[PDB]
Structure formats: C-alpha cells, structure tokens
Structure 1
Amino acid sequence: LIPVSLVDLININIIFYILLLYTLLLFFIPLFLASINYTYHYIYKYYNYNYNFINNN
C-alpha cells in the first residue's frame, strides 16, 4: 500500500507542514487569549466592604 512507506515516515514535506502550522500558532496566540471572562465584573459588583460605623453610645 502507498501509505506503507519508509519515505513517508520522515517526510520533510509534513515537517514543513508542522513547522508552518505551529509558527502560525505562535503568531496567533495573543489573539486566542483575547476572550473575556465576566468574573471581575462579579467581584466589583458583589464585593461589599462593611459600611456600618462604630458608635460607642
């Protein structure tokens, strides 16, 4: 069979494929990280320090 071949085991063409693929991955990481979570919105809205005052009398 064709895919049963030692030439296709260390094929430099697929290595170029992998190289270009992961270089492009590296180039686009800062866009994959650009998703917003709404957890600090929750922290801002719900974190309420104690607003009661001290009154000895």
Structure 2
Amino acid sequence: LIPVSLVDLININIIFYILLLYTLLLFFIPLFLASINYTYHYIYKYYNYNYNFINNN
C-alpha cells in the first residue's frame, strides 16, 4: 500500500502544511481571543457597597 512507506514518515510537504498552518494560527490568535464575557457587566450591576450612614442618635 502507498501510505506504508518510509518516504511518507518525514514528508516535507506535510511539514510545510504544519508550518503554514501554525504560522497563520499565530497570526490570527488575537482575533480568536476577541470573544466577550458578561462577567464584569454583572459585577458592575450587582456590586453594591454599604450606603447606610452613621447616626449616633
């Protein structure tokens, strides 16, 4: 069979495939990170410091 071959073990064509793939991955990482979580919206909306005043009388 064709894939049973020592030539296909260190195939430079697949090594180029991997190289181009992960160079493009590195280029596009900062766009993959651009998903928004709504946790700080929650923290802003729900964080309520104690607003009561002191009254000795």
Residue by residue over 1:2-27, the C-alpha shift from the partner in whole angstroms, topping out at 9 and shown as x without a partner, is 00000000000000000000000000
- The aligned length equals 57
Q: TM-score, normalised by structure 2?
A: 0.99
Coordinate RMSD, CA, aligned: 0.2
Q: TM-score, normalised by structure 1?
A: 0.99
Any gaps of 5 or more consecutive residues in structure 1?
Answer: none
- Distance in structure 1 (CA, Å) of the matches to 2:7 and 2:14: 11
User: 1:40 is matched with which residue?
Assistant: 40
